[PDB]
Subunit: 357 residues, 4 copies
């Protein structure tokens, strides 16, 4: 029987392993049972943001030394998804997911479950195109099976690490007689995120296949997933299963715009938190944020897209973090920017992991 444990650990810097080291050294976490670490690191969240890699390197070194294995093996075994940008009051932190096989009965109802799956490698001319959608969908279905979750309504978060294009890979594509979707590495990141999210939506039945095409993969924003969170294949499916002995559950909603506190409260209620006085049972909140293309919120203009000093994803992260912190009373929550085909234009999925009663 599977038991999932989730640890929200404050960090002092991208390389701070002290909270994790404390949890391993106290016996609460067997490092061999760690399956994923999702971080908010305090760099600028830009292309040339190496704090994500600094955090990943430091955690892999620490765990490799604790486990007696190489850094390469740790990075092959554990997903490392580092979301840069800690604007506003957002608190840098890591959320560590541990999965144990325990022989004990479940508890009343359904409880937290996690599954992992990988896709095949993509050719450069396949990024941002239907091949990526379909391979991601397949891997998502496999991850649901791994989690022993059969109902897509019980899937609450699909975390993806997706590839990107470099100049060298574009030259490879050109040499082989192929054209890439866009001759721009940064924009290629947007195309990879969007294709991956549409693949998630396809796998879960949130959109129908006849509505998805290559031309739609950066154009039709009416197509989006309510659970996808993609970052630039490795797949983590998080949901609830009847065959789980986890003392936790996950629920979610979708923010319609950057100030949609109602969606935050709906996600809280869906995770079993039914009043403000139960807030302390939250383990973590995970959300996507973005600037709406219209340049407005509820008909009100803002400068996010005109401001040459602060990039728009930084502002959106700060804003949505402030909103969530104001709902839940805690700014140490995960907010990630760039939500192509992830929730509506200007909004994004939001999930809550909470302890049961």
């Amino acid at each position: 029987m599977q038991k999932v444990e989730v640890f929200r650990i404050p960090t002092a810097s991208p390389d701070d392993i002290s909270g994790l080291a404390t949890l391993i050294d106290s016996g609460k976490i067997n490092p061999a049972e760690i399956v994923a670490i999702l971080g908010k690191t305090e760099g600028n969240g830009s292309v040339n943001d190496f704090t994500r890699c600094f955090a990943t390197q430091s955690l892999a070194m620490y765990l490799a030394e604790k486990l007696g294995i190489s850094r390469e093996e740790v990075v092959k075994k554990v997903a490392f998804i580092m979301s840069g940008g800690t604007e506003g009051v957002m608190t840098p932190h890591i959320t560590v997911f541990v999965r144990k096989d325990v022989a004990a009965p479940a508890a009343p109802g359904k409880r937290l479950a996690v599954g992992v799956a990988f896709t095949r490698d993509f050719l450069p001319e396949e990024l941002g195109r239907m091949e990526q959608v379909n391979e991601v969908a397949r891997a998502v279905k496999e991850a649901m099976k791994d989690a022993q979750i059969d109902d897509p309504r019980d899937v609450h978060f699909v975390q993806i690490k997706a590839p990107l294009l470099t100049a060298e890979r574009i030259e490879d594509a050109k040499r082989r007689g192929k054209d890439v979707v866009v001759n721009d590495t940064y924009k290629s990141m947007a195309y990879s995120r969007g294709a991956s999210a549409l693949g998630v939506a396809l796998a879960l039945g949130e959109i129908s296949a006849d509505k998805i095409s290559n031309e739609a993969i950066v154009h039709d924003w009416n197509l989006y997933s309510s659970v996808a969170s993609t970052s630039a294949d490795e797949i983590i499916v998080v949901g609830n299963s009847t065959n789980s002995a986890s003392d936790l559950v996950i629920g979610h909603s979708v923010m319609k715009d950057a100030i949609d506190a109602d969606a935050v409260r709906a996600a809280l209620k869906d995770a079993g938190i039914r009043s403000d006085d139960e807030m302390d049972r939250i383990v973590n909140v995970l959300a996507k944020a973005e600037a709406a293309s219209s340049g407005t919120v509820r008909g009100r203009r803002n400068t996010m897209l005109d401001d040459s000093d602060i990039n728009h994803t930084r502002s959106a992260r700060a804003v949505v973090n402030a909103v969530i912190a104001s709902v839940v009373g805690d700014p140490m929550v995960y907010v990630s920017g760039g939500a192509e085909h992830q929730g509506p234009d200007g909004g994004g999925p939001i999930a809550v992991i909470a302890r049961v009663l």
Copy 2:
């Protein structure tokens, strides 16, 4: 009988007067009755933010031409308080305060009232010191009289335009054998804002005189006003005071209420301020005319014990982040990001928090 009207006007740019012109040309506003305009302008919100002066120059030009007087007279007649910095989802806009003398009875209970007062000019060596505190207090009392407000519990917003130090005034002080509080223009802005807010607190009985001293004017963050909102700028000669509250002798269809944000994410204080302005449920939100609030990064570097990078971030200044944060919180409470959030809250609410006021239409009056 006094009637105060307040108009919140979206702007397309710092120099956009079209919404105000529309209200004047349709007859809803007599420009001669405008007493103050309080703006959020979309520059970077710092010292070298010229969008504020741009907005003020454009409005003074427009109103001077509408009134048939000089810009100098318009600026002498109308308060122009421009808060730069529209970070996050905060929507650039202006709030126009109009005070009319109308022949109609006062409304039942207390209703929106505004009063005006000016201080004497200050010598450079007096800014940030007890002389400014005391002069601000006196002027606030005069402004309460102008507003027909006798009870300090009925004061809900005290807007101040305060001075700052320049190099020439510091040299003047030195030449006269005197020292100034700081040889730093930006810190002088902080000292002027803080002394003015403490003067408000003194005038309203929020703190006792025996607890206030020069050494306290920047060091003891336990001394603060819950209604003061202070702003430093160009003019810099006399403190200008606008008192906003409620009076029994007012025929306004509006009221003001307030609370204090305990921290940058204190949505509860937003709800308390809304209820104090007569909005008792989410379904009455549409009666809001405007929200006016102070925001800041806490000196501790934390919010409710959680670290953030606001004070270490060399890309985004901490007051920019704080404005974005508190504006976002308020917007999430009221469903509208077009509210006024102003930075730099020395002695205005607690360290890391700030006053929050709501001007709202009354119900069934």
Copy 3:
């Protein structure tokens, strides 16, 4: 006979008219003879940069009050070109161009001449396309005629004010069944600047017409003008053209020369432009009136084979870095950071470079 005078005036702020007012009050400048003012103003040089408009509004007010005419007429009569962004050591300032008709013979040789011309209004669907190229070329030719300059080799600066797209203009174009070059206001600025610069190059014979097409207007960076300096408009909807060069029929005590910076550190091009304006050694620098240059980040991400981060830096926009760099280079050559450098150089010099001109006093 035409005489052009040029005054470089330090500013303390965007709305600072005090230096110009002082020059007017001393009798050195007749405001009725002012034809253009080109400023470097200290905002961030972006979309939401209102220091440019603040400077123009303040100057138009001042001149309206000095001349006894309305601001609308002043803005109709005098070119106001405010380039935001004063990064690095670059000093905010304005350069005022005055053109008088004086009764005096033709100074020996050729001397500074300036001409002005306006185009028709453009439809939103015309920006970034060949119609804009062709109209800009026409206007450059008209401005050359106004300046009494017949040789395109004698054009040393072509300053343009160009339109941009807003959401309303895009919707207007759409309603009539037309598509615009890009549904993006900032990129529309790039397309308008580039088409205008290619129109200048076309008018001056720097590139040949069959090689210019709509698809070429932002894709083929081998097409550029060596004297064009173009800037999207703040609030007007058209192109305004100032041609600055030298004419045999000029009595000016100044000349203009130019070169092209090949990259952001091409100090040699600075010295070549100086020599072309008659400054042949460091000891003649004091005859400089102003230096005018375009700057940009090269698309390659390198300078002389050396990588830089200008295009990856999410904190500092790349045009900001290029202005800081090229101004610093020029300042280090001439010993003065108070020179005009404007960013966004589509079809203005090579990829990663830009035109650079020097106006200097003669010695006769």
Copy 4:
């Protein structure tokens, strides 16, 4: 006999060790003979810039694995000086200093020499104060002895990696009843850099001791060293001193020279430093190994009487602008933007200026 070799290596990212690995694998550098690595890394150069420690961590890992020793020993054996911030056209890169003991005759005249010294640990209450000045001076003299340099006029670069205050050390000082020079870690970096540079100036005889006091240590900017280059950092302890100069008892194929930039656009001082390093015409530029320079915003807010906004820009830190400017000036003089420019020059050149040194090949 001492031989110093210096290698300027382009980097693709903070963690890029490939160029160094190539130089080791080809036999040009024996890593056991590496004494220092000086980097320009492409982060923002601020407080929350972790690209510097990322570079140090990556190099220490690589060298530890190549040398068969622990990371701690690698960091004990090799100086790691990482200057973040590659603004303008400045190119990320590393400069590797290798010191060999070779049995070869003394080069004619003076040639490149390097010496190393460490100070004792400092108590928190000592940073930014005369005790730091004096200990730096002691270590500088020891490094000169190590370099076989007796004449301070032959010292052309004194690189110091000097400490800072942290919250834990301030709390330690508080527990023991002591106050620190400033209760601010970021400002503490400025005080430590300035005290260290004044210690350099003291050791080399560039300023007299009677002119130095605590009140002068962040106030009297007329007291400065023309060769000191000092740098503070969280990543690793900061008790390291490198003296670089020329000695008659050296068998190297390089020399070092220097000047002082009077302001951020002082190209004349660049040319003077090149000539001082043996580069006498533009056609000999190719003998440059590297240029190392300090840049800063002048307190006046002007350069040669012309105003700028560097100190007013709340979006771009003023040191970022100064690095971009000075890198552009040097690149325009030498024709190459891959040169070392580091920000924060307290007591390093005049207010608004900074030292500039050139390491160049002989002919």
